[PDB]
């Protein structure tokens, strides 16, 4: 599935971010070129933009009581003007950031929830645009 592919991108990207930043990824255990390009795009976006996503994280204030609907409403703000590649990279970086914040809040149970929320959101709201615009191959053509 494209859905399966998308859940795997999510897990790869979050594992990479946790590993990179000193955290455990142990909740988790041509695709390769997409994963690599996405890893690199996340790093570039984070070095350059240095976004704390302060507004979003504070709006969410994630706890193990938080439901997907609340994540969806916040993340929707990245797409108020619709989808493009840079906002997709920002969505991946935002979810890496929420993962790291959850660990830092001693709420490590949320990491696997956030990967599930991200896959649902990506498959529901983002894939339509991705497919319309040449799929992940185009992502590699632009970034990779």
Swiss-Prot record:
Summary of the function given for this chain in its UniProt record: Potent inhibitor of cell death. Inhibits activation of caspases. Appears to regulate cell death by blocking the voltage-dependent anion channel (VDAC) by binding to it and preventing the release of the caspase activator, CYC1, from the mitochondrial membrane. Also acts as a regulator of G2 checkpoint and progression to cytokinesis during mitosis. Isoform Bcl-X(L) also regulates presynaptic plasticity, including neurotransmitter release and recovery, number of axonal mitochondria as well as size and number of synaptic vesicle clusters. During synaptic stimulation, increases ATP availability from mitochondria through regulation of mitochondrial membrane ATP synthase F(1)F(0) activity and regulates endocytic vesicle retrieval in hippocampal neurons through association with DMN1L and stimulation of its GTPase activity in synaptic vesicles.
GO molecular function ontology, one term from the record: BH3 domain binding
Source taxon at top rank: Eukaryota
UniProt motif (BH4) ranges: 5-25
GO CC annotation, single: mitochondrial membrane
Tissue expression: Widely expressed, with highest levels in the brain, thymus, bone marrow, and kidney. Bcl-X(L) and Bcl-X(delta-TM) expression is enhanced in B- and T-lymphocytes that have been activated.
Protein name from the UniProt record: Bcl-2-like protein 1
Short motif BH3, span: 34-48
Free-text note on domains in this protein's UniProt record: The BH4 motif is required for anti-apoptotic activity. The BH1 and BH2 motifs are required for both heterodimerization with other Bcl-2 family members and for repression of cell death.
Motif annotated as BH1, chain positions: 77-96
Sequence motif BH2, residues: 128-143
PTM per Swiss-Prot/TrEMBL: Proteolytically cleaved by caspases during apoptosis. The cleaved protein, lacking the BH4 motif, has pro-apoptotic activity. This phosphorylation is partial in normal mitotic cells, but complete in G2-arrested cells upon DNA-damage, thus promoting subsequent apoptosis probably by triggering caspases-mediated proteolysis. Phosphorylated by PLK3, leading to regulate the G2 checkpoint and progression to cytokinesis during mitosis.
Membrane topology: Single-pass membrane protein
GO biological process terms, semicolon-separated: apoptotic process; apoptotic process in bone marrow cell; cellular response to alkaloid; cellular response to amino acid stimulus; cellular response to gamma radiation; defense response to virus; dendritic cell apoptotic process; dendritic cell proliferation
Main localization (coarse): mitochondrion
The protein's assembly and partners: Homodimer. Interacts with BAD. Interacts with PGAM5. Interacts with HEBP2. Interacts with p53/TP53 and BBC3; interaction with BBC3 disrupts the interaction with p53/TP53. Interacts with ATP5F1A and ATP5F1B; the interactions mediate the association of isoform Bcl-X(L) with the mitochondrial membrane ATP synthase F(1)F(0) ATP synthase. Interacts with VDAC1. Interacts with BCL2L11 (via BH3). Interacts with RNF183. Interacts with GIMAP3/IAN4 and GIMAP5/IAN5. Interacts with GIMAP5 and HSPA8/HSC70; the interaction between HSPA8 and BCL2L1 is impaired in the absence of GIMAP5.
Protein species of origin: Mus musculus (Mouse)
Keyword line: Apoptosis, Cytoplasm, Cytoplasmic vesicle, Cytoskeleton, Membrane, Mitochondrion, Mitochondrion inner membrane, Mitochondrion outer membrane, Nucleus, Phosphoprotein, Synapse, Transmembrane, Transmembrane helix, Ubl conjugation
Family: Belongs to the Bcl-2 family.
Subcellular location: Mitochondrion membrane; Nucleus membrane; Cytoplasm, Cytoskeleton, Microtubule organizing center, Centrosome
């Amino acid at each position: 599935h494209m859905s399966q592919s998308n859940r795997e991108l999510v897990v790869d990207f979050l594992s990479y971010k946790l590993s990179q930043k000193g955290y455990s990824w142990s909740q988790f255990s041509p695709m390769a070129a997409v994963k690599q390009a996405l890893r690199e795009a996340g790093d570039e976006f984070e070095l350059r933009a240095r976004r704390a996503f302060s507004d979003l994280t504070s709006q969410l204030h994630i706890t193990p009581g938080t439901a997907y609907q609340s994540f969806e409403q916040v993340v929707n703000e990245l797409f108020r003007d619709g989808v493009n590649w840079g906002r997709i990279v920002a969505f991946f970086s935002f979810g890496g950031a929420l993962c790291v914040e959850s660990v830092d809040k001693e709420m490590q149970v949320l990491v696997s929830r956030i990967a599930s929320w991200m896959a649902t959101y990506l498959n529901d709201h983002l894939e339509p645009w991705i497919q319309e615009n040449g799929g992940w191959d185009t992502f590699v053509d632009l970034y990779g």
